[PDB]
């Protein structure tokens, strides 16, 4: 293997900085792009074993191949310092972000050909790298609808029809990553809910990729739930659960504009609503005027239901004559409405029972 080249690769792989530096300075005939038994050159080995000084020394060398693959490998393994060092290479002067540039050998690429550095960083959930790439304008392309009929999508479908679905699912996996959701959009909760809804919709259409799309929607739901979990005071809780209280008008005289909660229920998040932070607000809304009735026992509430069943005609009579009153405002409470409907159903069942009073015995 041209024992000089084998020694150079051996030094590069195991961080022998002085030997690789002396060879880069004094050889003048060493093949820099020579590969080992696995087709990995010095740069790929140095990136793989996380050697920063060797990486910088090789980057200063020109005509160095496998630089895009080196960046991709560094991103996939974290290595934030190495990623930043590679990004300073002239090939990435804000122009190569998001062919044959990312190939790791003569034939093929290390990852899927559609996986750009931003998509790979989102997949691996490297917050520093995702933030860096976003600052450099890297964006995931938000693939088109499943039934899109445009020329580009049609050509992609008729060409391979299997790389197309894989590219679509990779783009969605990048979009649905918590890191990209948190660092990309200005309204991460709303965007996460919308993306979860879209992925849930697409889960039914594609039978083969049903598990993957459901998993991505679950990731979006997990992001929303975790974002809710970190709230500490009622202001943050309202911001997460309700949204922008300035642009959104008040739901009622004292309601917190539950529009986003309705949207979350419609999207079957199932855990952004069941969270205790949402549970306390929902309970507070449930008992608007019955502040002291919350601490009563179950028997007390059963007695209240029976009393409402007894006095339902009186409540109906006083509702029309007095719209606003000490009792009238209480009756408008959601819990009082539920109790009234339940008591009405109890009265109906009692009427059904007593309709056959002539033959009980």
């Amino acid at each position: 293997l041209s024992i000089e080249e084998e020694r150079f690769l051996d030094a590069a792989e195991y961080g022998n900085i002085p030997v690789v530096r002396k060879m880069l300075e004094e050889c003048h005939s060493l093949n820099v792009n020579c590969v080992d038994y696995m087709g990995q050159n010095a740069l790929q080995l140095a990136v793989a074993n996380e050697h920063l000084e060797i990486t910088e020394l090789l980057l200063k060398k020109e005509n160095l191949s496998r630089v895009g693959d080196a960046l991709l490998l560094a991103i996939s393994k974290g290595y934030v310092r190495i990623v930043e060092a590679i990004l300073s290479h002239p090939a990435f002067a804000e122009g190569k972000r998001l062919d044959d540039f990312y190939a790791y050998d003569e034939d093929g690429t290390r990852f899927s050909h559609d996986v750009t550095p931003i998509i790979l960083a989102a997949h691996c959930q490297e917050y520093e790298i995702v933030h860096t790439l976003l600052r450099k304008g890297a964006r995931i392309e938000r693939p088109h609808d499943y039934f899109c009929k445009c020329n580009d999508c049609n050509q992609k479908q008729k060409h391979d029809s299997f790389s197309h679905s894989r590219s679509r699912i990779n783009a969605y996996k990048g979009l649905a990553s918590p890191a990209y959701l948190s660092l990309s959009s200005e309204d991460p909760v709303m965007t996460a809910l919308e993306l979860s809804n879209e992925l849930a919709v697409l889960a039914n259409i594609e039978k083969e990729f049903k598990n993957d799309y459901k998993k991505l929607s679950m990731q979006c739901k997990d992001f929303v739930v975790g974002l809710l979990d970190l709230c500490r005071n009622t202001e943050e809780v309202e911001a997460i659960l309700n949204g922008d209280v300035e642009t959104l008008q008040s739901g009622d005289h004292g309601r917190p504009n539950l529009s986003r909660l309705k949207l979350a229920i419609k999207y079957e998040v199932k855990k952004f609503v069941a969270h205790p932070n949402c549970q306390q607000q929902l309970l507070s809304i449930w008992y608007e005027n019955l502040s002291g009735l919350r601490q009563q026992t179950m028997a007390v509430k059963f007695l209240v239901v029976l009393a409402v069943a007894i006095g339902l005609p009186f409540l109906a009579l006083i509702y029309w004559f007095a719209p606003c009153s000490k009792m009238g405002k209480i009756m408008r409470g959601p819990f009082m409405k539920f109790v009234a409907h339940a008591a009405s159903f109890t009265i109906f069942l009692g009427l059904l029972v007593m309709n056959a009073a002539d033959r009980f015995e």
């Binding site: 195991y14 961080g15 022998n16 900085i17 002085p18 030997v19 074993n49 996380e50 050697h51 000084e53 393994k77 959930q125 917050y127 890191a179 948190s182 660092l183 200005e186 309204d187 991460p188 975790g226 974002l227 970190l230 202001e235 943050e236 911001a239 997460i240 949204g243 922008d244 300035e246 009622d252 539950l258 229920i265 199932k270 855990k271 609503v273 069941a274 949402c278 549970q279 929902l282 809304i285 449930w286 179950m298 339902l312 005609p313 109906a316 509702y319 009756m331 959601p334 819990f335 409405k337 539920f338 009234a340 409907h341 339940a342 008591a343 009405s344 159903f345 009265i347 069942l349 059904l352």
Partner: protein, 221 residues
């Protein structure tokens, strides 16, 4: 009578509100889909045996001691009540001398009972247990969501009267920035809360290797 039965069936609407019987009702309800899925095959086997027994005993309308397998309706009724053990064995005996058809009916009825009471019912029990395991895995959260839906059904300002008497007539941007920063920090900590794996440890071994090479080179000079 049927409407009274359905009205009392409607009583389960408000039971999710109670904490004592809400999650229990949700857990029982999540099994009904699997029960229906099994009942499809149950009805298939039922139709099989019903048509077989009806074709066997169609001619002996008067020879039979009872009218169990004379008509399609009677065969359906007899095989349905055989599930609960309310159908006797005398529904196979024939007053005529022919023991061939009587023993064929005995064998078919025994096979039906073995398939239904022993095999199918036990497999239904196993299916219900297997479903109820994963149902219990997430019972609390599902009950919470159901109760939230029940609350949101009443949060609207539209209906106030019951069924009787019904007939008559910026800062937000700051908070989001703060919460996103907090989430980034917490996600990084939770990632740090993962177990070390071979690759991670190797990256450290290569550090020491490069450090050794640098130090030995400096010592040589």
């Amino acid at each position: 009578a049927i409407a009274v039965v359905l009205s009392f069936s409607r009583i389960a609407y408000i039971l999710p509100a109670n904490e004592s019987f809400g999650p229990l009702q949700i857990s029982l309800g999540r099994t009904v889909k699997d029960i229906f899925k099994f009942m499809v095959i149950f009805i298939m086997v039922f139709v099989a045996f019903m048509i077989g027994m009806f074709n066997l005993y169609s001619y002996y309308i008067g020879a039979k001691q009872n009218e169990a397998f004379t008509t399609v309706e009677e065969s359906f009724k007899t095989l349905f009540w055989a599930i609960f053990g309310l159908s006797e064995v005398k529904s196979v005996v024939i007053n005529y001398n022919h023991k061939f058809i009587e023993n064929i009916g005995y064998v078919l009825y025994g096979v039906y009972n073995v398939t239904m009471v022993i095999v199918l019912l036990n497999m239904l029990i196993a299916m219900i247990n297997s479903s109820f395991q994963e149902i219990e895995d997430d019972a609390d959260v599902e009950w919470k969501f159901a109760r939230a839906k029940l609350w949101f059904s009443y949060f609207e300002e539209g209906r106030t009267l019951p069924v009787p008497f019904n007939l008559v007539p910026r800062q937000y941007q700051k908070i989001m920035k703060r919460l996103i920063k907090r989430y980034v920090l917490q996600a990084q900590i939770d990632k740090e809360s993962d177990e070390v794996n071979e690759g991670e440890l190797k990256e450290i071994k290569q550090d020491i290797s490069s450090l050794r090479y640098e130090l030995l080179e400096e010592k040589s000079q």
